[PDB]
């Protein structure tokens, strides 16, 4: 990124080092990129990338027989550099992903197969997800939205560094209704104590998904406050994570929530599907059910939707009838100031202070007129 | 009902008796109707009819003060024949139905009050229903539709005489998924045994709603098969009840299901409302979710909707494109014969063999043309 084309004569790069790390710095300047691996490499005859690859072609209906499988193996990048394929096919058979009809040896997708493909889910993750859902449908808590959120809470990657001492403090202060959900999932208070007392991550044993469970329940709490319209600064102080890690999490959970919804629909689990089908939109914007209609407008996010709701505008229909200058004023009240704000400067009438995507700078007035204009266009398309 | 006006010269009535019951028969011929009671009569200072009456006028907003209450007491039929009112007002206060603001002594409705009124529910029944729902939301089974049905299964009157021996036979053969729902509700196997072994109805103690629970769970099983499109004859043989008692039950449960849905909506219980809001339509016709669209047509019931679904017509949209004579044929296949049916009689082309409400006799042809005609009119109103 050193050197602007058409602007600079040269691009300069400086790597600051010490005498001790002097040799490692030179290694980088002379270093070159490593050769590209296939990521489908084989004491592991089976592998995730291959299992998914084989599942996609069989369920999709472009690979039926055993001859089609090895023909596919020829097209891979792994074979370009110049058994394992057969192992993945059996794996799909053992775990009810694929069917075999002896037309000798022809493979067809199951309901679980077609569901996994439509859900864009990884076959390795689908097994635990399928069990987790069946476990939840045997005993489910409906008095709050926490248990539902847990099912759509992603835990395939760490989104933040969790302070366990902070976690235990929230555990005790946690209401009884949410402790019931914790117990029902696997959250044991004993494991939480062995985390604060001693910084033993363990996780060496495969059976230590016990760690992931507590990380997942911690995350669901964050997502619970998030769709409860709890301020980002409160969530930051309460949990110990920045706004960057949160936004990356909600956009991840919004997508994941859609996956579990599709997965539940293709298996015929209507009751479970019915509950989940409202959280994709709520996780995206971080809102409650009431603001779901307002946030259809492009410029209206969580903060702008709430202040317009609390001012009499509950729906797009109510927002189309709106007086523009009234919308503008309500927007002006949602701004965050360090001092308890909420002189006359008439030189700020042209200040473009509202950002969009692929944006021209919008004034607070122009944005308001756009919100009312868009609301009317949507109101007509609703008929 | 003896004597047709404009037809008969006299109407004759004969009461057949023996010598032993001779005196009781004469008592009827000379007998006259008893005076009409008020049904709001008072060791019972409080009474159901009064509590409901007082609740309706306060929540509705036509009675606020204490003066309005006794003014209402004057308009009653009980006072027409010429304390207790004050007792009912306190009862509504004790059970969170009504609020009191000391403008000395002014009464307003609570959320629980406004919910009960909108639900058309009796205040006496609302207390147990409110507890039952809160109990269900703490631990709910979603793998089947049984637990949801239990919440909308009415038990304020007996709809049939339950054979307990038959019940215990269905209990053992009952799958594990439905035994979990039974335990979760209150169905104890010990009580079922003390019913078959000994015909002890008990029910003298008020705390013996334990009887109602088992009667309610028995009923939910019937409703489960009913919306699973299990034949009426199978349900008759399996449970021991006639088709008359069943139809009276489903139309009762369809109405009740709507009540619990409204009740849940006014309390803000969205998750619970979401699950219940699909069973009013299914209980009415006795169908599965797939036939919900077809049964919008007036002439299409459960039986006609299924045979049209299994023949390629899944929606009203598919049914508007239908060839009339094809619909007619599919209908002809749904008819029940004692022999394994499903000569050429062309004299039955005018036989009106299909009944409607406020009906002219419809031929199987005319009905088919009406179904396709109605489907098209509905398809246009859907846009
Ligand atoms: K938006
Ligand atoms: K109908």
Swiss-Prot record, chains A, B:
Q: Where is this region: Interaction with RAD51?
A: 343-383
Tissues expressing the protein: Highly expressed in testis.
Q: List localization entries.
A: Nucleus; Chromosome
> Which cystines does this chain contain?
none
Q: How is it modified after translation?
A: Phosphorylated by PLK1; promoting interaction with TOPBP1 and recruitment to DNA damage sites.
**What protein family does this chain belong to?**
Belongs to the DNA polymerase type-A family.
Task: Provide the function of this protein.
Answer: Low-fidelity DNA polymerase with a helicase activity that promotes microhomology-mediated end-joining (MMEJ), an alternative non-homologous end-joining (NHEJ) machinery required to repair double-strand breaks in DNA during mitosis. MMEJ is an error-prone repair pathway that produces deletions of sequences from the strand being repaired and promotes genomic rearrangements, such as telomere fusions, some of them leading to cellular transformation. MMEJ is required during mitosis to repair persistent double-strand breaks that originate in S-phase.
Subunit comment? Homomultimer; forms homodimers and homotetramers. Interacts with RAD51. Interacts with ORC2 and ORC4. Interacts with RHNO1; interaction takes place during mitosis and promotes POLQ recruitment to DNA damage sites. Interacts (when phosphorylated) with TOPBP1 (via BRCT domains 7 and 8); promoting POLQ recruitment to DNA damage sites.
Can you quote the domain comment? The loop 2 region is involved in the binding of the 2 ends of resected double-strand breaks and homomultimerization.
Pathology noted in the entry: Breast cancer: A common malignancy originating from breast epithelial tissue. Breast neoplasms can be distinguished by their histologic pattern. Invasive ductal carcinoma is by far the most common type. Breast cancer is etiologically and genetically heterogeneous. Important genetic factors have been indicated by familial occurrence and bilateral involvement. Mutations at more than one locus can be involved in different families or even in the same case.
> What protein name is recorded for this chain?
DNA polymerase theta
């Amino acid at each position: 990124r050193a050197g602007r084309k058409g602007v600079d004569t040269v691009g300069e790069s400086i790597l600051i080092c010490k005498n001790s790390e002097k040799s490692k710095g030179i290694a980088l300047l002379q270093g070159s990129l490593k050769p590209v691996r296939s990521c489908l490499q084989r004491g592991e005859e089976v592998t995730g990338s291959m299992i998914r690859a084989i599942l996609e072609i069989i369920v999709g209906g472009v690979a039926s027989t055993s001859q089609d499988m090895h023909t596919y193996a020829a097209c891979t990048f792994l074979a370009a550099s110049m058994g394992a394929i057969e192992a993945c096919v059996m794996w799909l058979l053992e775990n009810e992903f694929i069917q075999s009809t002896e037309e000798g040896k022809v493979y067809h997708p199951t309901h679980l197969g077609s569901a996994t493909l439509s859900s864009s889910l990884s076959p390795a993750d689908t097994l635990d997800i399928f069990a987790d859902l069946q476990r939840a449908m045997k005993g489910f808590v409906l008095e709050n939205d926490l248990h539902i959120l847990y099912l759509v809470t992603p835990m395939f990657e760490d989104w933040t560094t969790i302070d366990w001492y902070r976690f235990f403090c929230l555990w005790e202060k946690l209401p009884t209704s949410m402790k019931r959900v914790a117990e029902l999932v696997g959250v044991e208070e004993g494991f939480l104590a062995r985390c604060v007392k001693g910084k033993v991550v363990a996780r060496t044993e495969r059976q230590h998904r016990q760690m992931a469970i507590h990380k997942r329940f911690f995350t669901s709490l964050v997502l619970l406050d998030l769709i409860s319209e709890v301020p980002l600064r409160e969530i930051n102080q309460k949990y110990g994570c920045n706004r960057g890690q949160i936004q990356s999490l909600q956009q991840s959970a919004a997508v994941y929530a859609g996956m579990i919804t599709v997965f539940s629909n293709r298996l015929g689990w209507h009751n479970m599907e019915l509950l989940l089908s409202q959280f994709q939109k709520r996780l995206t914007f971080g809102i409650q059910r009431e603001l779901c209609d307002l946030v259809r407008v492009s410029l209206l996010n969580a903060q702008r939707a709430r202040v317009l709701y609390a001012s009499g505008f509950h729906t797009v229909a109510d927002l189309a009838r709106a007086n523009i200058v009234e919308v503008e004023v309500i927007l002006k009240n949602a701004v965050p100031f360090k001092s308890a704000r909420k002189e006359a400067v008439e030189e700020r009438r042209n200040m473009r202070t509202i950002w969009v995507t692929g944006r021209k700078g919008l004034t607070e007035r122009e944005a308001a007129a756009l919100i009312v204009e868009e609301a009317r266009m949507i109101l007509q398309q609703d008929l």
